[PDB]
Write a protein that binds this ligand. Sequence first.
Ligand SMILES: [Cl-]
Ligand SMILES: [Cl-]
Ligand SMILES: [Mg+2]
Ligand SMILES: [Mg+2]
Ligand SMILES: [Mg+2]
Ligand SMILES: [Mg+2]
Ligand SMILES: [Mg+2]
Ligand SMILES: [Mg+2]
Lengths: 235, 235, 6, 6
Amino acid sequence: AMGSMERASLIQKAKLAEQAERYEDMAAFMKGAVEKGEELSCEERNLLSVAYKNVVGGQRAAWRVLSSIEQKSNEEGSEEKGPEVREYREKVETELQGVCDTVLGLLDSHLIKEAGDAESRVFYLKMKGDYYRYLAEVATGDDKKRIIDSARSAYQEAMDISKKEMPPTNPIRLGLALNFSVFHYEIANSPEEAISLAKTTFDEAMADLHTLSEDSYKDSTLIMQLLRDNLTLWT
Amino acid sequence: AMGSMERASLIQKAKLAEQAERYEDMAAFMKGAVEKGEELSCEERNLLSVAYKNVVGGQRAAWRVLSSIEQKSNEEGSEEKGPEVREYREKVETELQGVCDTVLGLLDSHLIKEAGDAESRVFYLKMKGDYYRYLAEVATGDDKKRIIDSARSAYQEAMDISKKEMPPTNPIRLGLALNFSVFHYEIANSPEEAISLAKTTFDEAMADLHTLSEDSYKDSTLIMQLLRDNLTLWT
Amino acid sequence: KRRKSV
Amino acid sequence: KRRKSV
Ligand SMILES: [Cl-]
Ligand SMILES: [Cl-]
Ligand SMILES: [Mg+2]
Ligand SMILES: [Mg+2]
Ligand SMILES: [Mg+2]
Ligand SMILES: [Mg+2]
Ligand SMILES: [Mg+2]
Ligand SMILES: [Mg+2]
C-alpha cells in the first residue's frame, strides 16, 4: 500500500510517526521504504529497527500477560473458564509471529544480501537473531529447535563479523553482545555462556574507552551499563 | 467480524485485552458485544467506554503532536517541506473521525433509544457529547458549528436527566459535569460558563458527601478533585 | 498540566 | 527488574 509514495516522503512520515508515538504507522512507512529496493542509510536502519522494536515489544508484553493468565487457569483448583484465554493468547501470538515474519522477510528480500559494510551487515544479522529470538519466546512445537538455531546462527555470524571489523566499543557490537547474551540466558538455557559473554564484552569495551571522544564514550557506556545491569541481575 | 463469537466470550476477551493493554482489541470486542443487540450492564458500559477512551486518546494525542508540527511549518521563515506533514496529520485525523463515527453509530443504533434508566441514559448521552467534542477538536469546516451544537445538545440532555434523577455526588453526574465544563472552556469559548459549572458541581457534591458510605465517598471525591484541578488551572 | 476530563 | 535488551 506504500508503493505509490516517494521513498523520501515515507522516511519523513516515519520520523513524524515516531514523534507522535504511532509505531505501527512508523513500521509500515519503513517497510514501504525498504521495499523501494535501495539500501538503507544508518539513520534509516535505526528508524526501521525502532519502529518494529516498539510494535513487537507491545505484542510481547501483551503475550506475557495472557500467557501468565492462561498458566494460572491451568493450575489445580482453578475453575474452567472455557477456551477464551487460550484463543485470545493465540490471536496475539499469531499477530506477533506475523510481525516477526514481516521483518525476517525484509531482511531476506533483500537487505542482508546487499549489505557489505560491517555496520550494515552486523546490524541486519542482529535483527535477524532478535526476531528469531522473539519467535522462539512463543514456540512450543516441532520447529522450536530449528527457530532457536536460526537465532543462534544469525547472532554468531554477526559476532564473527563484529569481532573482525569493529572496535569493542562500537554500540552495534555492544548491543549485539547484550542481546546474544540474553538469548543464551533465556532461550538456550545457557546462563554461564550468557554471563561469560556479558563479562568479556564489558571488559573489552572498558579497555577501549580511552580511544573515544566524549560523545562516543557516552554512546558506548550507555550500553555497557545494560550489560552490567544484566550481570547484576544474573549473579 | 465478531458476529460468530458469543456475547459472554466477547465480554471475557474485552477484560483480558484491558489487562494486556490491547485497547484496540478491547474496543472491537465491546463493539461486537453491543452489536448482539442486548442492553449493557453497568460493568459492560464501563468496558465499552474505557476501550474507546483509550483508542481515541492515543489518536487525539498523536493528532495534537502532528498539528503542532504543521502549525510550525506554516510560520514565517520555516522551510517548505512539502505536503507530508499535512497528509499524515490528515491520515491520523481521518482515523480518529472514524473511531468517533463508530462510537456515535453504536449509540444511535441502538444503545440510547433503549436506555431508560438514568444511569444508562446519562452515561450514553455523556458519551455522545464526548465523541462529538472529539470531532469538534479537529473540525475546521462548514459543519463545525453543527458538530459543536450536537456535543452541547447531548451534554445538556444528560445534565437535565442527571439533575432530576441522580444525587449530586453520583460519579457519572460528576464526570458529565467535568467534561461539559471542559467543552465550555475549550470548544465553546465560554470559560466563565466552564468555571461556573465546575464550581457549582463541586459545591453541590461537597454538601451531599455526608450521605455516603466510605467507598462511595472515595468514588465521588476522586472526581471532585478533577473539578478542583481544572478550577486551579483556569483561575 | 493539561485540564482533566473523564 | 526485567533483564535488558536493545
Ligand atoms: Cl480471540
Ligand atoms: Cl500519510
Ligand atoms: Mg521516487
Ligand atoms: Mg551494498
Ligand atoms: Mg572497522
Ligand atoms: Mg449466544
Ligand atoms: Mg431499556
Ligand atoms: Mg435516582
